């Protein structure tokens, strides 16, 4: 399986380390960069009390029974709407 | 299959007893509950 | 080491046939009785 | 002979129609007179008596074909006991009906059934084969 | 660009794994990892069956491709014969005892 | 760090009749006893919770 | 496979082996009763003579019982076989099971 | 001593023994549940006076017979006892993990019983379909407890499946090919594969049901765009392989038993038997929606599921005929185990043949959710699986114990059982053709005669269950110790004596290559 | 005085099977055919006869007069 | 000489069959079990309206 | 004495503690969901950790210290592990099936479209893509670690393994952050339900996988592994690849196709 | 054009047993058509067909629930 | 309905159900043939003293016992499939009726023209009039025109139910959020009964279905009066 490379006659750990630093890690830096310049933040979506969303058929069994586990006040409305 | 004669023979009288106790251990506690169903149904 | 041979490779004793019989009778009878007592319990709960 | 339980790794004697010549003789230890009989066997067999021929046989084999294939009366016990315990089960049924079951619904009263039958005939239940087909609507009776 | 520091089996293997490794090195098979090879199995050329006691269970696959193995105890003493195909087997002592 | 494997091999191969889960000494025994106590006490408590849940309440 | 005549001959040979041993005798009879046939008198004859060389009177009787057992409901097979073996039975002093009373329970 | 041996075991024989004790005890529970069903239906009207309780009883009947009686006895019990002995292996591959497969069953069973004691129990059917099994129609802990019970049974069987496949692949004598292993071993291998593939899917489906009940997911709830039919897929994708899983080891025992008591050295067409079990295993994964012919699937899907299901009769016919061919020419010994085997062969066929009737989605419209289904599957289970269990139990009882059963008593027991299971289940075909629904606590009056007979038949089988306990006591009370067993040259499990020592094969068998 | 004739001695089991397997088909087919003639053909004939001179209105009318319907008195 | 089945078989057979038949016949017909058989040819229909 | 090469395991209390700990965990969850109490659960979790700790320590004692893992024993452990991964695959299959069923035939209550009305999916090209590159990268570094080990290179084995663990941890922190920022929750109909349960179980496997790798790092530090014998490391690497592959499927199905 | 409406005819777009999407689509079509025929002061009778078909096929509670949601601004279909 | 001691299917009221009845007869004939064959063979194997306990050759006899059953399955599947397509075939209904399952009763909607709907409950046993059937009668029957193709739509407003009428060949599960279609056609007028056929709780056994089949003109008058 090819895309622009050699390696097969004498190798091993050396070849794999080469691929770790020459290709794998730089891809991670490239994607991190690509991520870093899309951050800032994002327009909190408008609240519409859709009945297929914000399901409560039984309270959650922590806090006040109405907040999901990774609740984020900024972007996660309750069934009655965003919190003050 | 071949076997040695019983080391501790269970005679016909002993079988009768084994059989009786076995059957009663099943029938009594069940009969007791079923007999009293209505008493329970008047809950 | 563990005892080997007939009547030794089981977790209950068969040394006395009358004691065995009481045991089997508790063992099998409790399993048989259990559902009748679960039905009773549910009737009496209301 | 006396077969022992630790002998399980040693060849053993069976009587089977399909394995007529087992791995060992039925009797392996011989009395003084039995040894002398085994000695006789080395000579012509016309010189052995019937009794001696029979004893030779019994040293080698436990049962004859005729004995090993004998039928028994066991079936009678099995069937008789089965029937007895089946009959015993009827006592539990009588018990249950007497002390456990209350009354059946009133829809099984004779008058209910007569009426219910008529309505069923009025609505032509299973008119093709099952039910109403068995009623003669002209003669107003069950078909003969 | 390569150090060492990783021990080898030869340095560090212990207990039974070591015994197997060592016996393999000397071409021996004391823990019965390999299938033994039939001899001709006649009276004079019997299958020699190693054991640490006085009897061992033999299974005989009489012909290539039989689905059924014939099992019997082989005892110390004269050669015995598979009761199905008559190949001879004789029990031989120890070795595997250190 | 240094290779102390040989010592451990020596300690765990020691022919003292102890099973592997107690061969390391006093600490094995404690940890074993603690694990057992929590399991058996936990089980007892779950039985108590069942019987308590099996009846209706307020 | 192989023919009737080929089958009979191989068995006749098997039991004719001068120095047949006790294990071989047994193996031969225990194999033969596996087949869907009652063995030809020529085969039984050879087997009987093998018992004689091994000085084993009891096996000769047992072999006759088995010929009778294999015939199952075919009542005619056994008397015919005994008829054909009668010269051998007289020569060797072999008594039938019926003559020993071993056919009765 | 006692604790080390019985609570901390790492031995395949003692752990097979714990399985058999457990499965026996569960079997009494399942029996009692079955008699409550029949007492309620035994006359028109209401007996318990609470149909939620009847629903709970029916639901628990099923879980207990399946997860707690059949699987632990066939796979845990006979599996552990026989598989290492049939291939010369000193024990299972993972002897300690094996003990955990066993110890998860009592807590699992505890949770099942807890569910029937809190709130009003889980009155759902063993299929546990939402929205009925959901947190509105079944609010409270009962259905959650049932779910956790299934999780633990699942995990137990998955680790058991891993242990069996590994042991069977890796611990045979080096010279022995998979094509030299006995049919019981194959049957367990194949069953272990089905288990490994199907149980995680169930585990997924009931995990989704759990989160719908407690975490506000809506996998199966139309209000969030979920779909109750999705649950039926996941469940039956597991559920159809489960029903082969319950019979395959039975097939394997039947092949041994029939072979043994015919006096044969091997079953007829060994490779055709291997092929038939493999084929059953594979086709059992692609037919599950014949459990869903009434849910409103497209006609081309139903045409496909009818056709694939029918094809299963072919490899099954091969095994049935191969058993009959193994009898041909046998030296038949009419032992009690052989009578269980023969009644298995005939009654399994009957239940198999009414499966082919149901495979037709056309006719299934009218027969689905009626007593015809119930007649169908008690034929293969109660005269298939149970009959195989009884035939296996009497055949190998002397190997496990060292003692013999009284043969005459065992034959009385078979005759009574044979009458009672037929009297119970035969009339239920008429109930189903005539239209009586499953899962009803009372019925229109027309259905009275067959229901009455059927409940009477269920008492006959009760009497056989009680007699069986006594027949077991009589064996241990008399102590007739085994001396000799026939045909050991082709039945390796007997060769170490009865019972075999704690360790067998410390020195492995010797098998030549050639 | 007279010898017994040589009987057939080979393939006795196979010969029994040859014969009986024919009988086994006869009987099998026999049950199937009885079911075909006594039940299935009877059934088709019952339905063909019932509908040949059936009148759904006459049927209705009798049912109406018997008083069975909520919709029609 | 005679086994258990030889001495007792006939007695066990006769008396098991007899007990079984009596008690079933009694249970089926004297204790008021409603079998609800076919009304066909048995029941005279009566006006219900 | 035995003359086969298989392991007869000393009698052991851990199966029973494990089973009990399962009973306590599921009793606990029950008590948690219906009675707001967490005590049973904490107890079940505690005893489950202790069980796993001791059971696995014992396996290390039996193998690195007592020499019980002959080639035959080691061959069985390979099969057992591959089989265990297969059952995990069929478990994930169940949730993929739930996702495809819901998204290919979206119901009226959702607006009859996929993604549902009102749902605002994450951008597959942002963090999910970074996450993809993180796990793929760790598949490279673990292969490097494997080869260093096989070539007897202690230093680079530890360095490759450390980088693999770090990528795993980064994946887990990025995923936690993504969960926090997500504008939908598990209670948002079947879209939240299939999304959080499927990625959540995956997230849990990354944690277990990362743990298994950390255990391997310490065993390595302590010289347990030889250049030919390190099955615990191999199993952790199979498990790591599986976690990796499952992520690729999640990404293609749910984040990309399903967005 | 097509009166003597008896019932919804076969619709080859929904040929199977599951008719959910048939109720749904025709509901959408009606309200889409009604929206358009209001924006240009037009006559709503051109939409009548969709109304009849969804009246025949849809359960009262679905229709009624969907109408409430349209009023409330939570209907999730595109109209 | 079923009558006492019934062995088979209820008499067919629709063409479809009559088609199932004959297909059942064809299948059952085969079932009888195979089971009798097996039973004869088992008993043939057990009734002889003759033996043959050595190896037998399998691969000639396996052909017969693979080809025969495949032929048989084909004789069952062909007509099975013809019927299935037919149960599905292109209808042209004159009427659409909806039924909605609830715990524990059915409602019915006839909304082609006017908005008619009503609930349909079992008559308790103590309220039955003489000649009336225990567990089967409802207070409000589903009145429909005989001899016409009707579209039934089935659904639920709560848990799963299943709407069935054996003598018409009808059984369609009732699933919330879903609309399942079946077609109904009676050759005769009268009363035809069925029962909820998917376990729905405590009163599963007590939510029956009564169809009342009448001439169109009676059907229309009944509708108007039910508004
Ligand atoms: C061991 C358990 C078991 C077994 C082995 C089977 C075997 C089969 N079953 Fe069954 N079945 C169940 C247990 C099992 N069943 C259970 C529990 C249910 C209910 C689930 C529930 O709702 O609770 C069920 C339900 C079930 C249904 C669902 C119907 C419904 O609910 O409406 C269907 C439909 O196709 C089905 C079909 C089959 C078929 C085709 C086989 C085949 O595998 C049978 C093959 C065997 C033979 C055919 C006989 C031997 C063959 C010959 C002698 C050859 C010649 C024969 C021919 C040419 C036909 N079964
Ligand atoms: C990178 C994170 C990795 C996951 C680990 C996180 C911590 C919690 C533990 C869960 C691990 C197990 C998986 C259970 C599935 C559910 C959790 C899904 C992952 C998750 O955490 O989902 C979160 C909500 O979860 C919630 O309720 C959390 C509620 C947690 C309660 C646990 C539920 C217990 C379920 C037991 C199931 C049994 C499993 C069976 C085993 C198989 C046996 C064969 C999403 O947060 P949210 O606020 O809705 O939306 C984001 C809003 N901005
Ligand atoms: C390698 C394996 C062998 C491969 C064999 C290939 C055969 C399998 C088929 C593959 C799936 C094809 C899916 C594309 C076809 C479209 C069908 C479809 O889209 O079906 C929809 C759901 O499908 C869905 O979830 C589809 C969900 C898929 C689940 C399928 C179940 C199989 C799972 C097996 C697990 C395999 C395990 C191995 C994993 C490594 C439902 O139907 P609708 O159209 O909404 O109804 C509309 C009505 O309202 C109007 O009539
Ligand atoms: C709510 C939060 C709960 C979660 C908490 C976190 C849980 C933690 C689990 C982490 C997993 C750690 C596993 C460590 C096992 C170490 C034992 C080991 O690795 O043992 C090795 C054998 O492998 C072996 O048994 C192989 C053993 C393989 C086990 C791997 C299985 C992990 C599965 C865990 C559970 C999955 C749950 C999935 C849920 C759906 C020893 O052999 P070698 O390595 O060759 O050494 C010997 C050489 O030294 C000789 O020279
Ligand atoms: C599904 C299995 C069905 C099994 C059928 C049961 C078979 C019958 C066993 C007998 O059971 C006993 O019957 C007594 C009555 O005959 C009950 O006594 C009750 O009635 C007596 C007499 O009327 C009083 O003396 C007692 O105090 C009172 O408890 C007694 O409790 C009960 O144990
Ligand atoms: Cu509604 Cu069952
Ligand atoms: Cu199925
Ligand atoms: Mg159903
Ligand atoms: Na009742
Ligand atoms: Zn051989």
Tab-separated table of N, CA and C in Angstrom, chain L residues 5-11 14-20 23 52 54-62, chain M residues 88 90 92-96 98 100 109 111-113 115 117 151 153 155 157 172 177-181:
chain	number	residue	atom	x	y	z
L	5	UNK	N	-65.235	11.516	-4.738
L	5	UNK	CA	-64.225	11.059	-3.755
L	5	UNK	C	-64.916	10.064	-2.846
L	6	UNK	N	-64.457	8.809	-2.839
L	6	UNK	CA	-64.916	7.854	-1.847
L	6	UNK	C	-63.873	7.736	-0.731
L	7	UNK	N	-62.656	7.361	-1.139
L	7	UNK	CA	-61.516	7.345	-0.247
L	7	UNK	C	-60.182	7.605	-0.941
L	8	UNK	N	-59.113	7.776	-0.160
L	8	UNK	CA	-57.767	7.918	-0.720
L	8	UNK	C	-57.493	6.730	-1.626
L	9	UNK	N	-57.084	6.996	-2.859
L	9	UNK	CA	-56.732	5.852	-3.757
L	9	UNK	C	-55.335	5.296	-3.462
L	10	UNK	N	-55.028	4.089	-3.924
L	10	UNK	CA	-53.685	3.607	-3.926
L	10	UNK	C	-52.682	4.676	-4.379
L	11	UNK	N	-51.565	4.798	-3.696
L	11	UNK	CA	-50.558	5.775	-4.096
L	11	UNK	C	-49.218	5.052	-4.179
L	14	UNK	N	-46.363	5.168	-1.958
L	14	UNK	CA	-46.434	4.443	-0.688
L	14	UNK	C	-47.121	3.102	-0.912
L	15	UNK	N	-46.399	2.137	-1.507
L	15	UNK	CA	-47.061	0.872	-1.855
L	15	UNK	C	-47.118	-0.203	-0.733
L	16	UNK	N	-46.442	0.019	0.374
L	16	UNK	CA	-46.347	-1.019	1.407
L	16	UNK	C	-47.327	-0.840	2.580
L	17	UNK	N	-47.178	-1.678	3.576
L	17	UNK	CA	-48.097	-1.740	4.698
L	17	UNK	C	-47.964	-0.479	5.605
L	18	UNK	N	-46.760	0.056	5.674
L	18	UNK	CA	-46.524	1.180	6.466
L	18	UNK	C	-46.937	2.442	5.711
L	19	UNK	N	-48.046	3.034	6.152
L	19	UNK	CA	-48.636	4.203	5.472
L	19	UNK	C	-48.392	5.519	6.199
L	20	UNK	N	-47.559	5.516	7.239
L	20	UNK	CA	-47.307	6.707	8.026
L	20	UNK	C	-46.944	7.892	7.130
L	23	UNK	N	-49.944	9.625	5.226
L	23	UNK	CA	-50.660	10.599	6.044
L	23	UNK	C	-49.860	11.900	6.127
L	52	UNK	N	-58.494	16.101	1.751
L	52	UNK	CA	-59.367	14.957	1.823
L	52	UNK	C	-58.556	13.686	2.135
L	54	UNK	N	-55.517	13.501	3.460
L	54	UNK	CA	-55.007	13.368	4.814
L	54	UNK	C	-56.125	13.235	5.854
L	55	UNK	N	-57.334	13.733	5.570
L	55	UNK	CA	-58.445	13.517	6.513
L	55	UNK	C	-58.796	12.038	6.597
L	56	UNK	N	-58.689	11.351	5.465
L	56	UNK	CA	-59.091	9.957	5.403
L	56	UNK	C	-58.062	9.085	6.089
L	57	UNK	N	-56.790	9.377	5.841
L	57	UNK	CA	-55.663	8.562	6.312
L	57	UNK	C	-55.153	8.849	7.730
L	58	UNK	N	-55.096	10.098	8.140
L	58	UNK	CA	-54.450	10.422	9.408
L	58	UNK	C	-55.369	10.230	10.621
L	59	UNK	N	-54.830	9.694	11.752
L	59	UNK	CA	-55.672	9.590	12.934
L	59	UNK	C	-56.002	10.998	13.415
L	60	UNK	N	-57.186	11.216	13.960
L	60	UNK	CA	-57.582	12.525	14.503
L	60	UNK	C	-56.505	13.077	15.460
L	61	UNK	N	-55.902	12.233	16.309
L	61	UNK	CA	-54.975	12.813	17.316
L	61	UNK	C	-53.667	13.294	16.712
L	62	UNK	N	-53.240	12.709	15.595
L	62	UNK	CA	-52.038	13.166	14.943
L	62	UNK	C	-52.305	14.528	14.391
M	88	UNK	N	-51.325	-8.778	-0.302
M	88	UNK	CA	-50.770	-7.466	-0.384
M	88	UNK	C	-51.269	-6.666	-1.593
M	90	UNK	N	-52.987	-4.994	-5.146
M	90	UNK	CA	-53.519	-3.627	-5.415
M	90	UNK	C	-55.052	-3.544	-5.328
M	92	UNK	N	-57.842	-0.871	-4.470
M	92	UNK	CA	-58.973	0.041	-4.726
M	92	UNK	C	-60.091	0.005	-3.664
M	93	UNK	N	-59.782	0.465	-2.457
M	93	UNK	CA	-60.766	0.392	-1.383
M	93	UNK	C	-61.903	1.397	-1.579
M	94	UNK	N	-63.088	1.108	-1.053
M	94	UNK	CA	-64.198	2.050	-1.178
M	94	UNK	C	-64.297	2.873	0.062
M	95	UNK	N	-63.508	2.501	1.060
M	95	UNK	CA	-63.700	3.098	2.378
M	95	UNK	C	-62.390	2.998	3.179
M	96	UNK	N	-62.048	4.000	3.984
M	96	UNK	CA	-60.916	3.852	4.887
M	96	UNK	C	-61.445	3.907	6.300
M	98	UNK	N	-60.040	3.791	10.438
M	98	UNK	CA	-58.880	3.681	11.348
M	98	UNK	C	-59.263	2.996	12.657
M	100	UNK	N	-57.549	2.537	16.655
M	100	UNK	CA	-56.413	2.965	17.466
M	100	UNK	C	-56.461	2.147	18.719
M	109	UNK	N	-62.223	5.286	13.937
M	109	UNK	CA	-62.425	6.560	13.213
M	109	UNK	C	-62.835	6.302	11.743
M	111	UNK	N	-63.396	8.709	8.807
M	111	UNK	CA	-63.223	10.092	8.473
M	111	UNK	C	-63.114	10.387	6.968
M	112	UNK	N	-63.525	9.469	6.108
M	112	UNK	CA	-63.623	9.836	4.709
M	112	UNK	C	-64.525	11.089	4.498
M	113	UNK	N	-65.603	11.236	5.271
M	113	UNK	CA	-66.596	12.292	4.995
M	113	UNK	C	-66.919	13.139	6.197
M	115	UNK	N	-66.561	13.492	10.548
M	115	UNK	CA	-65.608	12.998	11.504
M	115	UNK	C	-66.283	12.118	12.534
M	117	UNK	N	-66.106	9.058	15.241
M	117	UNK	CA	-65.295	8.131	16.017
M	117	UNK	C	-66.000	7.766	17.285
M	151	UNK	N	-60.073	-0.336	3.455
M	151	UNK	CA	-58.754	-0.145	4.031
M	151	UNK	C	-58.867	0.037	5.556
M	153	UNK	N	-56.653	1.041	8.762
M	153	UNK	CA	-55.367	1.564	9.270
M	153	UNK	C	-55.295	1.294	10.744
M	155	UNK	N	-53.173	1.612	14.456
M	155	UNK	CA	-52.146	2.250	15.258
M	155	UNK	C	-52.511	2.184	16.756
M	157	UNK	N	-52.219	4.533	20.627
M	157	UNK	CA	-51.936	5.776	21.290
M	157	UNK	C	-51.185	5.491	22.549
M	172	UNK	N	-52.871	-7.400	12.450
M	172	UNK	CA	-51.890	-6.307	12.156
M	172	UNK	C	-51.518	-5.654	13.465
M	177	UNK	N	-47.083	5.876	16.704
M	177	UNK	CA	-46.198	6.626	15.806
M	177	UNK	C	-46.233	5.965	14.454
M	178	UNK	N	-46.951	4.871	14.328
M	178	UNK	CA	-46.967	4.201	13.040
M	178	UNK	C	-48.403	3.849	12.538
M	179	UNK	N	-48.583	3.885	11.212
M	179	UNK	CA	-49.847	3.523	10.585
M	179	UNK	C	-49.703	2.231	9.706
M	180	UNK	N	-50.262	1.129	10.189
M	180	UNK	CA	-50.158	-0.078	9.454
M	180	UNK	C	-51.468	-0.316	8.701
M	181	UNK	N	-51.348	-0.724	7.457
M	181	UNK	CA	-52.493	-0.917	6.612
M	181	UNK	C	-52.787	-2.415	6.382
